[PDB]
Write a protein that binds this ligand. Sequence first.
Ligand SMILES: CC(C)(/C=C(\C#N)C(=O)N1CCC[C@@H](n2nc(-c3ccc(Oc4ccccc4)cc3F)c3c(N)ncnc32)C1)N1CCN(C2COC2)CC1
Length: 267
Amino acid sequence: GLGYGSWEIDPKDLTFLKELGTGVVKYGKWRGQYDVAIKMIKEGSMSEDEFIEEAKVMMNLSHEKLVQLYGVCTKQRPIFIITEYMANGCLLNYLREMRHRFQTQQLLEMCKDVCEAMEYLESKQFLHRDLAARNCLVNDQGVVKVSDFGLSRYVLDDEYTSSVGSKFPVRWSPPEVLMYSKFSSKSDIWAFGVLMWEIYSLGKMPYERFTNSETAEHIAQGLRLYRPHLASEKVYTIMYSCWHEKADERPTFKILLSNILDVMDEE
Ligand SMILES: CC(C)(/C=C(\C#N)C(=O)N1CCC[C@@H](n2nc(-c3ccc(Oc4ccccc4)cc3F)c3c(N)ncnc32)C1)N1CCN(C2COC2)CC1
């Protein structure tokens, strides 16, 4: 209504129902009826004007395997990001809960969910820039969706923002990122291969016995993760294809999707 742009949600339309943890995220309703998650952005943590402009672009991204951004509440502090509600939370935690007793068919479907979202982002020339299990969410039906897409661009804490930083995603980064800060579609591809490894490893940390420094050296020497016990040879071939030293030899998300579908048919 009056005073709200298409990207702006009126926070008075929100009903807060549950604390989901930590900025802080809550579960609630929008206009009484619709489930939403509300993420409250810690003051000083984000380049807010830049994020708000990008939120307009992100509003136009729509795919069933991508967490939907509904809008932002910006007339205020902290600002809110309003999204689709994902009842089963973070993929990384979901994987680590051994009660689920996942079949490998379920693990491959999680990979396909993510790959479909990434094929969609690739088709829109939109890089994720921090793809990892910790940045995927799981709904009440067990469907995995990609979250936080592109958001690293607006983080102000310099520990997060380059390889010099102590909170940079070294373990999800190809050699050309670690060496040269060369981001591309192919750095998302590399990260996707690591995500498949996380899925088939039930949420182990990649290179779990190494520091970030040691990981960077391992990768730069041409060495890699190796096959999770739950990955078949064909699944391992797919994740490993994401880790070619030469970025241009790595597949596209379309090719990965075709490979995943082929393995689902065969296994
Ligand atoms: C504390 C606890 C119980 C929780 C978790 C673990 N893990 C856990 O799932 N979290 C963290 C808190 C928050 C949660 N979260 N975040 C979101 C969200 C993400 C992104 C987002 O902005 C976007 C921006 C751009 C584009 C797209 C989205 C908005 C969100 F609202 C969300 C959403 N949309 N729906 C549902 N949940 C949601 C995930 N954990 C921590 C881990 N613990 C383990 C360690 O011992 C057990 C168990 C309990």
